[PDB]
DNA sequence: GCTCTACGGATGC
DNA sequence: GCATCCGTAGA
């Protein structure tokens, strides 16, 4: 049954444990976290919540043995200094010592080990959660109990009465359900080592271990570093943007109240519909009798401008309560950098394979949009609020149209490869063809509309929605659909091949092999089947783009680790002088790698990032990037050097 | 009958 | 009233 060995009680036992740890090439370390129970005696205070504390580690290199490395200050021969030195030495990789450390919730445990314990993990990582996601990307978030049930059933009764292993977070890190951190961490290590061995066998069966250990887990390490750095924030810039946005919101509200007389509430869809359709003419679209989406008011723009006022009000409100308040709320402070950063929580459990940041979402920050504030547009830019550290600069690296290049790779579209290799900007060409204007005289918003039209046609947009977005008839939209499909015959061939392969195999394989299972391809409902086909087409391209982005991130992290000898992260600086000099991955936009590169190495790291992103996994189409240097995320001036 | 994600407000059996 | 649904934003 349970077998926990206190390696911090006897000197000879400690030395034997250290020797066995050094001899072994695969660990299962885990973190024991309890309540304060009240500081500096019970253990290291974990950064963030002040009600939790770390007590020690639990290592299990096979079997039920759960050697517990106690970090408690209460064997006098083993002081904190020598114990921590041994822990760091055994957790440091050197002289080609292959060691696969297995850690549940690797990102959070890495952050805890660095920020509180001051221990820099440098070995390989084998997060069981990441392997579980790799097996079933579109499945729900893998709880500890879920992995134990689905991969290690025989060890299930060891979790008897352990209901704390249900809230996503590992039982080792939470402090509820009693179960003092010793037993919790030890049993957690026992569970995760064997479940990760089973996960490795399954990965070998599915031929997914190479991607798991070469790109997926190194990208998880890069995301951990991202979480320790965190995207920048300026506070004052966001305050100014909020003040201007609120002033414009008040002006719009007063103008609308003057126009319509009464004080109808914008937030109420029923009130808006009543004041628009059944009271002030404004014939409806094709209570809640009439739809009141953004598209409806956008269509009703040639009429009197109240729908435009409501659209501006809605956009400003969405920017002010969904993007401004969350940033001002979940905003931290970094005393070492002297500036107010904000650390998002990364999540790689997305369906296609992208990385999305929660609490808050830095990716869904609306870009620069002009506002009509009479006094010419103020061009409200709250991405301006994401300033880097003083003496640094954002070094964003956005791929030239990435799903297009990956499409041309996996289509054998001679036309598309020819167009993309010799830069022609397919989206600008589409805008020029649609609007009959010259390709050199197309605005940014027209370019974005053309890009969303092209991607829609790629991903099976219907004629009705195509005509609705493009402002043309159903027949004209269908004719445009056939014109686009015939122009790129390889794209259509790839679409049919994708649908056939997803129907035959039940899943779709990414460029490296991170298969996504789509049983809906066998659905009988026509809408569900069509959605499954479209999401399979989008998976093999979008997940491939995210996987290429992860490879580029891994390569850039490697190159900025060998070069620019310094701490690998701001959290590394906090745990363990001189000006800042490094890359410091801060944010990802599913095709764009924002880096908090210092001013001294702006050119060098810019060249390194561009080279490692272009020289990443190569296709029949050259992968182009547009490195943009900015004093913030707003003024990203082009950087072709 | 474009995809992926988050996320706050609106309904809701 | 948890529990989604829906509509907004980014890619
Ligand atoms: N289905 C769908 N996918 C999109 C859409 N926009 C972007 N994607 C994907 C394509 C790329 O993998 C990724 C990059 O989005 P961007 O806004 O940066 O456009 P893109 O990089 O393709 O071109 P650009 O940066 O303007 O030169 O997002 C869209 O409107 N629909
Ligand atoms: Mg791009």
């Amino acid at each position: 049954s349970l077998s926990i060995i206190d390696v911090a009680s006897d000197q000879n036992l400690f030395q034997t444990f250290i020797k066995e740890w050094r001899c072994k090439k695969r660990f299962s370390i885990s973190l024991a976290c309890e309540k304060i129970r009240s500081i500096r005696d019970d253990g290291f205070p974990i950064k963030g919540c002040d009600d939790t504390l770390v007590v020690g580690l639990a290592v299990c290199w096979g079997g039920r043995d759960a050697y517990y490395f106690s970090l408690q200050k209460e064997d006098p021969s083993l002081t904190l200094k020598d114990r921590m030195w041994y822990l760091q030495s055994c957790l440091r990789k050197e002289s080609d010592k292959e060691c696969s450390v297995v850690i549940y919730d690797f990102i959070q445990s890495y952050k805890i080990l660095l920020l509180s314990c001051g221990i820099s993990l440098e070995q390989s990582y084998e997060d069981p959660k990441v392997a579980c996601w790799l097996l079933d990307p579109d499945s729900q978030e893998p709880t500890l109990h879920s992995i134990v049930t689905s991969f290690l059933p025989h060890e299930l009764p060891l979790l008897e009465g352990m209901e704390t292993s249900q809230g996503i977070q590992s039982l080792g890190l939470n402090a509820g359900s009693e179960h003092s951190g010793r037993y919790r961490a030890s049993v957690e290590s026992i569970l995760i080592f064997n479940s990760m061995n089973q996960l490795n066998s399954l990965l070998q069966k599915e031929n997914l271990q190479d991607v798991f250990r070469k790109v997926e887990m190194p990208s998880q390490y890069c995301l951990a570093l991202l979480e320790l750095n965190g995207i920048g924030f300026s506070t004052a810039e966001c305050e100014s943007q909020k003040h201007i946005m609120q002033a414009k919101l008040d002006a719009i509200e007063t103008q609308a109240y003057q126009l319509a007389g009464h004080s109808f509430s914008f937030t109420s869809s029923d009130d808006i519909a009543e004041v628009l359709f059944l009271e002030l003419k404004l014939p409806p679209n094709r209570g809640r009798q009439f739809s009141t989406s953004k598209d409806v008011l956008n269509k009703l723009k040639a009429l009197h401008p109240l729908p435009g006022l409501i659209l501006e009000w809605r956009r400003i409100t969405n920017a002010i309560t969904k993007v401004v308040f969350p940033l001002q709320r979940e905003k931290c402070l970094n005393p070492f950098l002297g500036m107010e950063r904000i650390y998002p929580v990364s999540q790689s459990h997305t369906a296609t394979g992208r990385i999305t940041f929660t609490e808050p979402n830095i990716q869904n920050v609306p870009r620069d949009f002009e506002i009509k504030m009479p006094t010419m547009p103020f061009s409200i830019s709250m991405r301006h609020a994401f300033v880097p550290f003083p003496g640094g600069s954002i070094l964003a690296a956005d791929y030239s149209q990435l799903e297009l290049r990956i499409l041309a790779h996996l289509s054998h579209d001679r036309r598309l490869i020819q167009v993309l290799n010799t830069g022609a900007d397919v989206f600008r060409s589409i805008a020029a063809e649609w609007k009959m204007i010259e390709p050199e005289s197309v605005g940014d918003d027209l370019r974005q509309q053309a890009k969303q039209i092209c991607y829609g046609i790629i991903y099976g947009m219907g004629a009705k929605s195509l005509g609705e977005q493009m402002g043309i008839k159903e027949n004209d939209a269908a004719c445009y659909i056939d014109s686009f499909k015939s122009r790129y015959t390889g794209i259509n061939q790839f679409m049919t091949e994708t649908v056939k392969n997803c129907k035959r195999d039940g899943f779709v394989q990414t460029i490296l092999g991170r298969r996504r299972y789509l049983p809906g391809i066998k659905d009988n409902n026509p809408y569900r089947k069509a959605h499954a086909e479209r999401q399979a087409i989008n998976t093999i391209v979008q997940g491939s783009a995210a996987d290429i982005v992860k490879i580029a991130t891994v390569n850039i992290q490697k190159q900025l680790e060998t070069f620019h000898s310094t701490f690998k992260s701001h959290g590394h600086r906090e745990g363990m002088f001189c000006p800042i000099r490094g890359g410091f991955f801060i944010l990802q936009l599913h095709d764009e790698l924002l880096y908090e590169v210092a001013e001294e190495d702006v050119v060098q790291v810019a060249q390194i990032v561009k080279n490692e992103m272009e020289s990443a996994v190569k296709l029949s189409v050259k992968l182009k990037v547009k490195v943009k240097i900015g004093a913030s995320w707003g003024e990203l001036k082009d950087f072709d050097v």
Side-chain angles (χ1 to χ4, degrees), chain A residues 1-36 39-49 51-80 82-163 167-285 287-369 371 373-437 439 441-641:
Chain A
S1 55
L2 61 94
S3 179
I4 298 96
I5 285 89
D6 281 321
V7 314
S9 59
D10 184 70
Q11 188 85 20
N12 171 265
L13 180 51
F14 182 57
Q15 297 302 323
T16 307
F17 156 76
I18 290 296
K19 284 172 31 53
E20 253 282 346
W21 213 3
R22 299 264 184 77
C23 180
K24 289 300 297 183
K25 298 191 306 176
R26 173 190 286 262
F27 326 134
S28 193
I29 81 143
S30 170
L31 272 310
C33 290
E34 311 181 12
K35 289 296 183 184
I36 306 294
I39 302 181
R40 213 172 308 277
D41 295 72
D42 197 20
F44 304 98
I46 167 185
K47 177 253 179 181
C49 51
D51 57 2
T52 325
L53 183 121
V54 80
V55 183
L57 288 69
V59 195
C60 161
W61 47 66
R64 300 296 184 87
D65 278 299
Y67 301 87
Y68 179 87
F69 201 166
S70 177
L71 311 193
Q72 290 270 31
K73 289 296 299 176
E74 43 89 16
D75 198 5
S77 63
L78 290 182
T79 65
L80 191 59
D82 58 74
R83 264 211 281 261
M84 291 295 278
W85 172 88
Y86 268 106
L87 188 41
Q88 167 258 359
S89 179
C90 297
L91 277 184
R92 201 147 279 193
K93 181 185 68 178
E94 82 277 346
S95 74
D96 293 68
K97 181 56 183 180
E98 186 185 27
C99 293
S100 299
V101 182
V102 173
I103 291 186
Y104 183 95
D105 200 13
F106 155 67
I107 304 178
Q108 185 66 24
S109 299
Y110 186 97
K111 295 164 40 82
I112 291 174
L113 276 175
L114 211 70
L115 301 172
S116 75
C117 305
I119 290 163
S120 179
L121 251 176
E122 315 203 67
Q123 288 129 335
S124 297
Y125 322 110
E126 274 188 324
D127 199 338
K129 263 202 314 184
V130 174
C132 293
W133 168 76
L134 215 79
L135 297 192
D136 209 318
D138 67 309
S139 99
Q140 43 174 350
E141 301 253 350
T143 36
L144 217 173
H145 184 274
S146 179
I147 317 159
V148 179
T149 301
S150 187
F151 296 123
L152 202 68
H154 72 85
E155 162 86 30
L156 209 30
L158 254 289
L159 285 177
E160 186 172 357
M162 298 203 99
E163 76 268 356
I168 307 297
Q169 193 155 79
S170 60
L171 61 93
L173 297 188
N174 57 46
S177 190
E178 223 279 320
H179 286 152
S180 181
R182 257 184 26 82
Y183 176 75
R184 258 200 285 97
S186 301
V187 72
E188 140 82 338
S189 307
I190 297 170
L191 301 147
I192 61 173
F193 187 82
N194 293 262
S195 53
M196 194 46 206
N197 276 339
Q198 225 276 348
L199 280 170
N200 278 8
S201 73
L202 279 181
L203 290 179
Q204 263 254 290
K205 141 172 272 163
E206 292 276 300
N207 205 337
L208 255 55
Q209 221 177 345
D210 277 328
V211 46
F212 170 72
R213 254 201 311 260
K214 288 281 292 303
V215 31
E216 195 54 47
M217 272 325 293
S219 90
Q220 277 283 101
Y221 164 68
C222 299
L223 286 179
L225 299 191
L226 183 157
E227 293 192 15
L228 283 109
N229 316 307
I231 183 64
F233 211 67
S234 188
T235 293
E237 271 282 343
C238 186
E239 286 285 340
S240 174
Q241 250 64 80
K242 169 178 68 177
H243 282 346
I244 295 184
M245 234 168 311
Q246 263 173 40
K248 184 54 191 298
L249 205 58
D250 291 356
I252 278 305
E253 180 252 24
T254 51
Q255 203 156 300
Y257 284 8
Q258 158 189 347
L259 192 139
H262 47 97
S263 298
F264 62 100
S265 181
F266 292 100
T267 53
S268 179
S269 173
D270 290 0
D271 282 59
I272 285 326
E274 285 175 1
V275 79
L276 251 67
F277 310 107
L278 57 104
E279 141 178 341
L280 163 56
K281 313 303 282 294
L282 265 293
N285 43 42
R288 290 167 60 162
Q289 45 272 348
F290 323 119
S291 175
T292 319
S293 63
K294 170 153 210 218
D295 164 89
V296 182
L297 315 179
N298 253 332
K299 286 191 323 291
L300 316 197
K301 273 284 301 303
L303 309 182
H304 99 292
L306 181 62
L309 266 57
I310 298 173
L311 281 174
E312 248 183 359
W313 189 101
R314 249 197 266 274
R315 289 202 330 258
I316 277 154
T317 299
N318 173 35
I320 210 79
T321 170
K322 276 189 49 57
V323 162
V324 157
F325 268 104
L327 294 185
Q328 300 282 112
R329 167 192 60 188
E330 301 276 0
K331 164 178 52 58
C332 305
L333 202 147
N334 193 277
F336 308 96
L337 292 191
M339 83 165 246
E340 271 205 9
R341 316 208 59 80
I342 160 176
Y343 309 90
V345 152
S346 169
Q347 170 184 345
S348 316
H349 207 83
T350 69
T352 38
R354 339 190 87 176
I355 298 154
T356 50
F357 303 94
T358 90
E359 291 273 70
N361 205 334
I362 326 291
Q363 299 170 333
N364 300 340
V365 170
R367 19 178 66 191
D368 301 6
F369 71 130
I371 223 67
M373 172 56 217
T375 294
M376 141 177 179
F378 271 171
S379 66
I380 288 184
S381 167
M382 40 205 210
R383 292 186 164 182
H384 212 310
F386 295 105
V387 77
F389 60 88
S393 100
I394 311 287
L395 187 143
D398 171 88
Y399 272 108
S400 148
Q401 39 266 14
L402 184 49
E403 281 175 353
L404 260 190
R405 318 239 149 182
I406 300 194
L407 261 183
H409 172 53
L410 314 110
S411 42
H412 319 309
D413 220 286
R414 332 291 294 183
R415 185 102 71 102
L416 196 41
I417 287 125
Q418 164 196 334
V419 169
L420 286 176
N421 265 86
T422 53
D425 219 331
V426 192
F427 297 149
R428 258 181 155 87
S429 172
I430 280 194
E433 190 257 7
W434 159 39
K435 282 298 189 61
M436 335 202 200
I437 43 189
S441 52
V442 43
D444 208 333
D445 76 318
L446 188 50
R447 184 211 151 81
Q448 288 279 153
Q449 193 168 355
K451 147 166 52 177
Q452 314 206 235
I453 274 284
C454 174
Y455 280 137
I457 309 175
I458 288 304
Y459 298 140
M461 223 185 211
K464 160 176 328 314
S465 182
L466 194 83
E468 181 166 320
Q469 183 179 14
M470 204 157 24
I472 70 178
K473 262 274 154 178
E474 153 87 359
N475 293 17
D476 299 331
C479 291
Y480 194 72
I481 285 299
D482 308 274
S483 296
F484 190 96
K485 280 194 206 327
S486 290
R487 175 141 81 161
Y488 307 141
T489 325
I491 285 306
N492 189 19
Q493 295 169 12
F494 172 56
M495 292 326 168
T496 79
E497 285 286 341
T498 293
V499 170
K500 185 192 312 192
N501 289 18
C502 197
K503 289 213 70 202
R504 175 176 50 93
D505 293 358
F507 60 93
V508 280
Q509 210 174 271
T510 313
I511 201 182
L512 287 203
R514 314 186 295 97
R515 59 212 41 200
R516 177 164 184 253
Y517 287 83
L518 298 175
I521 216 81
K522 280 192 172 60
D523 220 316
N524 301 327
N525 175 267
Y527 170 71
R528 303 222 170 286
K529 169 96 161 283
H531 179 40
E533 296 165 16
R534 299 201 304 291
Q535 71 185 141
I537 288 133
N538 176 87
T539 282
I540 317 154
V541 190
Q542 187 160 126
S544 174
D547 164 345
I548 292 199
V549 161
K550 279 178 292 187
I551 294 163
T553 310
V554 172
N555 294 8
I556 292 165
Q557 201 57 233
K558 289 172 177 172
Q559 282 230 331
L560 83 82
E561 276 172 3
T562 84
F563 262 135
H564 332 91
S565 52
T566 192
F567 320 116
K568 325 182 195 66
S569 162
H570 296 121
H572 285 71
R573 174 170 295 102
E574 144 159 13
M576 45 274 279
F577 66 97
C578 285
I580 322 187
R581 280 170 105 265
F584 298 148
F585 191 31
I586 43 181
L587 190 63
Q588 160 172 335
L589 301 163
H590 313 151
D591 85 318
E592 187 164 356
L593 276 74
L594 268 80
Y595 280 92
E596 211 176 0
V597 178
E599 151 56 12
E600 301 105 0
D601 324 309
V602 151
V603 45
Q604 186 212 3
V605 183
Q607 202 203 359
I608 273 168
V609 163
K610 175 154 56 187
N611 284 337
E612 295 306 304
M613 290 186 72
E614 293 179 3
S615 154
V617 286
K618 71 182 312 272
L619 325 173
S620 55
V621 151
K622 174 198 305 300
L623 281 181
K624 273 193 81 93
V625 312
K626 270 148 298 186
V627 172
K628 313 173 73 58
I629 281 314
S632 265
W633 196 14
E635 50 262 29
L636 275 182
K637 297 293 173 294
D638 213 328
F639 184 81
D640 295 326
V641 194

